[PDB]
C-alpha cells in the first residue's frame, strides 16, 4: 500500500520510531514525473503498476518485512 | 645439394666428434666438450645406419666412455646429452642419461650444506580435512590455489576451507586418483586476503560476510559438499 508514496508532513521534518514502538502515519503520492532512482535500488525506473511487481519481488528476496508477493513469479527480460 | 642451416650445424658437430675420437685414440683424457661431442656424433651415425631404435640408442650411449677415459670432474658435469637424429621414420629426439660414472673427488660447483631443516609457514596453525574424489578423472591441486574453489567433483566439507590453501612446499602438489580418499592440511591465506579469480566464487575481500555469498554461489553451481541453508537473503551486490 506504500508504493510510490511519501510522508504527509512539513518538508524537512521527520518521524521517529523507538525499538518496539508502533504507530500510524499518513502517506501521499509522490509528485512530478514519478521517476524513482536510488534509496535501496528497489525500483530505479518509472513508478507504475508494472514496476510494482518487480519491486515487491526484489523486496521479498532481500528480506524486507511485510512484503507479500505471490509464488510462481514470472520474470521479464529486464529486471 | 640444397643444404639447410640444420645440415651445416650437424656437419660441424660431426667433425667435432671426430676430433674427440682421434684424441681418445692417442691416449689423451677427454674434457667436457670432447665427451659431449663424441657421444652426440656416435648417436647420429647409428641413427643414419637405420638398424636400431631410439630406445636402444638411449642405452647404447651409456657404454661409450669408461670412467678412466675422461679428466677428473667431467662425469659430475654431464647430467644428460640430447641430440636429434633422422631415423628411417623421421627426426626423433634421443636423450642419454648419466653417460659416465665418476672416479675422482673433484666436483665443480659443489654445494656444502648445513644439516638443519627449514621450517616453512611459521606461525600458521593448520587444520585437517578429509577429501574424496567421486569423479572418474584424476585431479591435482597446487600449493597456493584457493582450496574452497577446487574441482566440483571433489567431495569435502567446503565451509571449513574458506580462505585457506595447502600447507606444503611452494610449487609442489597433491594428487587425487578416481575413487581416492585422503586427508590434507590447510592454512590461512596471507597478505591482504583479497581473492580474485579461480572460479569467480569470491572476487572480493575474504571475510565472514563474503563466505555466505560464496557458499550460496557454490551450491547453485553444484560444488560437492557445500552446505548453505534454505531461505537465503540476497544483498544489493552479489
Amino acid at each position: 500500500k506504500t508504493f510510490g508514496k511519501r510522508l504527509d508532513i512539513a518538508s524537512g521534518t521527520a518521524v521517529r520510531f523507538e525499538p518496539g514502538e508502533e504507530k500510524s502515519v499518513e502517506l501521499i503520492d509522490i509528485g512530478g514525473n514519478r521517476r524513482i532512482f536510488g534509496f535501496n535500488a528497489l525500483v530505479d525506473r518509472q513508478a507504475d503498476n508494472e514496476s510494482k511487481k518487480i519491486a515487491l519481488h526484489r523486496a521479498k528476496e532481500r528480506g524486507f518485512h511485510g512484503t507479500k508477493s505471490d509464488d510462481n513469479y514470472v520474470k521479464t527480460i529486464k529486471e | 645439394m640444397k643444404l639447410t642451416p640444420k645440415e651445416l650445424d650437424k656437419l660441424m658437430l660431426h667433425y667435432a666428434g671426430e676430433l674427440a675420437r682421434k684424441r681418445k685414440e692417442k691416449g689423451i683424457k677427454l674434457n667436457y666438450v670432447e665427451a659431449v661431442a663424441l657421444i652426440s656424433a656416435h648417436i647420429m651415425e647409428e641413427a643414419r645406419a637405420g638398424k636400431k631404435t631410439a630406445a636402444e640408442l638411449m642405452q647404447e650411449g651409456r657404454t661409450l666412455l669408461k670412467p678412466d677415459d675422461v679428466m677428473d670432474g667431467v662425469a659430475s658435469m654431464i647430467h644428460e646429452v640430447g641430440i636429434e637424429a633422422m631415423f628411417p621414420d623421421g627426426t626423433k629426439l634421443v636423450t642419454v642419461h648419466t653417460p659416465i660414472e665418476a672416479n675422482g673427488k673433484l666436483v665443480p660447483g659443489e654445494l656444502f650444506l648445513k644439516n638443519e631443516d627449514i621450517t616453512i609457514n611459521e606461525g600458521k596453525k593448520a587444520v585437517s580435512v578429509k577429501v574424496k574424489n567421486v569423479g572418474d578423472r584424476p585431479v591435482q591441486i597446487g600449493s597456493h590455489f584457493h582450496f574452497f574453489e577446487v574441482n566440483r567433483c571433489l567431495d569435502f566439507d567446503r565451509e571449513k576451507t574458506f580462505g585457506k590453501r595447502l600447507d606444503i612446499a611452494s610449487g609442489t602438489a597433491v594428487r587425487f586418483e578416481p575413487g581416492e580418499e585422503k586427508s590434507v592440511e590447510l592454512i590461512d591465506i596471507g597478505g591482504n586476503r583479497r581473492i580474485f579469480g579461480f572460479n569467480a566464487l569470491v572476487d572480493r575481500q575474504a571475510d565472514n560476510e563474503s563466505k555466505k555469498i560464496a557458499l550460496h554461489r557454490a551450491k547453485e553451481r553444484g560444488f560437492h559438499g557445500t552446505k548453505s541453508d534454505d531461505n537465503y537473503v540476497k544483498t544489493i551486490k552479489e
Binding site: 514525473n33 514519478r34 518509472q46 507504475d48 | -
Partner: protein, 95 residues
C-alpha cells in the same frame, strides 16, 4: 496498441490520414491495405488479417482522445500513408 497512450513514459502521436473520422475513411484505408500487402478477397486468411487491421472502433475513438488531451502530437507519415501538406489543416478540422 492504443492502450499505451495512457502510460506515463509514453509520448503518443497520431498521423493525419485517420483524422478527422469521415464516412470515406474506412473504405479508403481498406483498399490501401489490400494494394500494399497484395491481398486477395478469395483467401480466408487475408480477409481475417485485414479485418483485424483497420478497426473503425479505435479510429472513431482517436478523435475524442485528441479532444481529451490523451494524444499529444500530430504528424504526417509522408508518402507512406500520410499527406505532408495537410498536418495543420487536419488538426484544425479535427478541432
Amino acid at each position: 496498441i492504443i492502450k499505451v497512450a495512457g502510460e506515463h513514459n509514453i509520448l503518443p502521436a497520431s498521423t493525419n490520414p485517420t483524422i478527422p473520422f469521415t464516412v470515406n475513411t474506412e473504405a479508403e484505408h481498406m483498399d490501401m491495405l489490400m494494394v500494399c500487402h497484395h491481398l486477395d478477397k478469395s483467401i480466408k486468411e487475408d480477409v481475417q488479417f485485414a479485418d483485424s487491421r483497420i478497426r473503425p472502433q479505435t479510429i472513431a475513438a482517436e478523435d475524442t482522445l485528441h479532444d481529451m488531451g490523451i494524444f499529444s502530437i500530430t504528424s504526417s507519415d509522408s508518402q507512406a500513408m500520410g499527406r505532408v501538406g495537410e498536418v495543420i489543416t487536419r488538426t484544425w478540422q479535427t478541432a
